[PDB]
Amino acid sequence: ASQVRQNYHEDCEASINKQINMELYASYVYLSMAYYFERDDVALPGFAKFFKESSDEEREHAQTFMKYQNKRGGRIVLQQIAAPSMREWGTGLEALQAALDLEKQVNQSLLELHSTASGNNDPHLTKLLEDEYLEEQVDSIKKIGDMITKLKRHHHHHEYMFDKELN
Amino acid sequence: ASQVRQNYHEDCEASINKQINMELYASYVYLSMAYYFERDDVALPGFAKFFKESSDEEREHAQTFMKYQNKRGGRIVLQQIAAPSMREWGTGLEALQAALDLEKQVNQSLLELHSTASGNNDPHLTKLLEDEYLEEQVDSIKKIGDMITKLKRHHHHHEYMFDKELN
Amino acid sequence: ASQVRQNYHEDCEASINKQINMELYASYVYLSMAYYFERDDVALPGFAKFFKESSDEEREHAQTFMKYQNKRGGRIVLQQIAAPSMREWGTGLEALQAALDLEKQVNQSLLELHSTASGNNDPHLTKLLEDEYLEEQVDSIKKIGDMITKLKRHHHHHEYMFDKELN
Amino acid sequence: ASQVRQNYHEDCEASINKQINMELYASYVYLSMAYYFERDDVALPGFAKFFKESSDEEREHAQTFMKYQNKRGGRIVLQQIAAPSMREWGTGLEALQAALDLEKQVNQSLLELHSTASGNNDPHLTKLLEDEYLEEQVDSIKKIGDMITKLKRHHHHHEYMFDKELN
Amino acid sequence: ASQVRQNYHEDCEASINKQINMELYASYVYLSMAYYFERDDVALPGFAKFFKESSDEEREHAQTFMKYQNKRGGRIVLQQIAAPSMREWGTGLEALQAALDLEKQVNQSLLELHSTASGNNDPHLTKLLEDEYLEEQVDSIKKIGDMITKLKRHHHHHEYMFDKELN
Amino acid sequence: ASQVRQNYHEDCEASINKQINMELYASYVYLSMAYYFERDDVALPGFAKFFKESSDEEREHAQTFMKYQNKRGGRIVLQQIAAPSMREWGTGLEALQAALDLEKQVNQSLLELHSTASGNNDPHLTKLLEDEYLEEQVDSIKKIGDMITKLKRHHHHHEYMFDKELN
């Protein structure tokens, strides 16, 4: 194996490559959303900017894991990247609900990666997860939750005024 | 329940709430020491600034935990803040000695929360305590321990000189 | 008593202590509110911030009174700080209504404290109440009343827009 | 259909959607090269930076096309992004040669899109392809051809110095 | 023991001392290297400077551990610092290979020290190892590996050019 | 032998090497004093800064001699650095008294090297010792001698006041 590899379990090496794929798929979804709210019959620039930023940060997530793979001497495996779930994301409100669920789904995967890393006594990897993914996951889920509470109060008039505060 | 809650055990929720009350209780004790060192018959302006700053940090500890209750999607439930042990704190040394004892009692309970957090595999909350509370506790216990040594020396003139250090 | 004490009747000394408790219990109420309006299921950052500031300002009324007690040679006597009524304030309009009433409870005590100081021919203490307390109380009550008038115009879409004017 | 749609053939709409998936795929391939040249057993810091910017520029080729799909009032349709042809990319020169090939396959699809645009009398779309795509690919093919020539002249001391020019 | 000591098991106290010795012996190795590469018959200023910095950084890992021991109320126990293996490292590639292996010896102890702290439920000490030591160790090991990969391209003319990139 | 060696007796070479070990040994002793004045039960931050700076200058003395071994074309041969005499240094006065004794033992050996250098008519090395080491020794012995006088006075309060001089 690699000259730098030390205390690096192959089960961890492999969940990193599975997680990179999930980070990228999450990137693709926020990209689909981002430009959907830019359609002439949707015209929500606030929501569109928020989901463009989400897709960039999901891209950054994936890069930080590929950098990590190489740091420990593992070898990236990247699969295909599935097409997003849906493609018509409905209201801004249904988009945020979709995103809330996708961000909880990623946190479940990151809490699993953490347990797999604790179970192999990889305290470097648990440090990575705590300091760069667990805290970003909890803050974002709270961010989105806050937004869905503001935006559940029906009219299209309300979405548009909420949108402007996003922008 | 909550739209953000994920992997936050109800025992962690409950022990965050006891700990909000305990931090505020510490604020109240230090606040009492602060102003007692301002009595015209005590008039040590260095201990007064030290304990008033201590009182302030203890309220940030509590608020950081209340912020945290809400990030994870638990409910803040506040309780009555007991009045301090004393209102007359004796000497600066005897107040330091009581400071040190209560920072030590705050750390025992923070480490108990870390033990609850671990047992419920909540890495998000063990990281909160490691980075935000356990290093501040140790450093405080050590600064207070250092000053107790400098002051321990008996004399009234030595204390008024140590006091100007802390101004 | 004290080397400094002069024309400071003990009923005023004792009322200043009971007033310190009320102010500190007023702080606790507002801090409750402050972090309630930060819950993901509430998400009114403007209200939250208004109650944070109020909570901080009640803590300072308390410190001024404790500074004052020491200035006049009386002795601070701290007691327990009760937890609020209910920690679920409901809407912002309902919280503000609780605040209006709380500010009037503290105005009525402050005015009683001022009659005690007048009855006992303490003009230094009348002057403290007039300058440092009664004016903030009438400013605060009026502001709150102004805000309630604005907010009574029942849907949750109005509240979000008022919450931004306050942010 | 869309209230903005004018003179936008559905074949061109479909070819933009196909081309979006090709820009993204090129993004992914350049992402694999980028991070493969940062392996501890490859460690070519310049080749890696060159492909990072390539990967990023491909991503923005795709977002222009999706930006454009909406201007003309078509509907973005994204599909799976295939995994890159490889995982190892060999020497820096082999990665360029694969990138010479790849940019040429993109230029070929771009030029076919132009012919579709021309046959369906879309001068707005021919304009876009001429002004935002066709010139960057001729310019990129020439840059890469130049580098291949420099690097060809087998020994591996020479490759590390070429990386030097690249960082 | 100490007025400050709390939840600091004596096996961790003793391991911190043995770790201080290792770090200080790691400093000695690098200082040897540093001035070897400055001999007139060697004359690799870049290598020399790299090993000077490394030597200085090992001295600081040692100081942090001695600061830490005092923070937790244990007692520093210093012992002799062995002279290196051989003081003739030969080529730069051979020195770097010795450094890679040394950094992995210190990584394996640091990871053992971290299992000791975990076994003894010291989360303050796990946190110190994670933040302050394990991350530098994986960065350092990977860097060294990267440098060895670059340098294996056997003639002494390559080495001089790599030595300048490092200068 | 060396391409730079000229008029550098092998006895001078050998005595430079004993002296590198002796300077590093001094660094280690001062380093021990440095951190012992940081124990929570000693807590004299002025002696700690004085001895930590002393430890640092002693390592520059050693490195200046290793640089020098290589200027003249001799071989650095490093040896084991003995652990300090003590780890508990008693009072600041008793540590100063031990500082003074070891600066006096360093000067005896520097003057012995000057005597070896002279006898081997090496004016280059007698000038090194005159300008770089013998004036620093005398000045140190005198500063330490001055402080021993200021401190000698018995009392705990006087030492904590002298200590703030040195901060």
Ligand SMILES: [Fe+3]
């Ligand atoms: Fe992510």
Ligand SMILES: [Fe+3]
């Ligand atoms: Fe995410």
Ligand SMILES: [Fe+3]
């Ligand atoms: Fe605290």
Ligand SMILES: [Fe+3]
């Ligand atoms: Fe505290």
Ligand SMILES: [Fe+3]
């Ligand atoms: Fe008030």
Ligand SMILES: [Fe+3]
């Ligand atoms: Fe008030």
Ligand SMILES: [Fe+3]
């Ligand atoms: Fe492209």
Ligand SMILES: [Fe+3]
């Ligand atoms: Fe391209």
Ligand SMILES: [Fe+3]
């Ligand atoms: Fe180290």
Ligand SMILES: [Fe+3]
């Ligand atoms: Fe190291």
Ligand SMILES: [Fe+3]
């Ligand atoms: Fe010296």
Ligand SMILES: [Fe+3]
């Ligand atoms: Fe010396």
Ligand SMILES: [Zn+2]
């Ligand atoms: Zn951390």
Ligand SMILES: [Zn+2]
């Ligand atoms: Zn050749």
Ligand SMILES: [Zn+2]
């Ligand atoms: Zn060459």
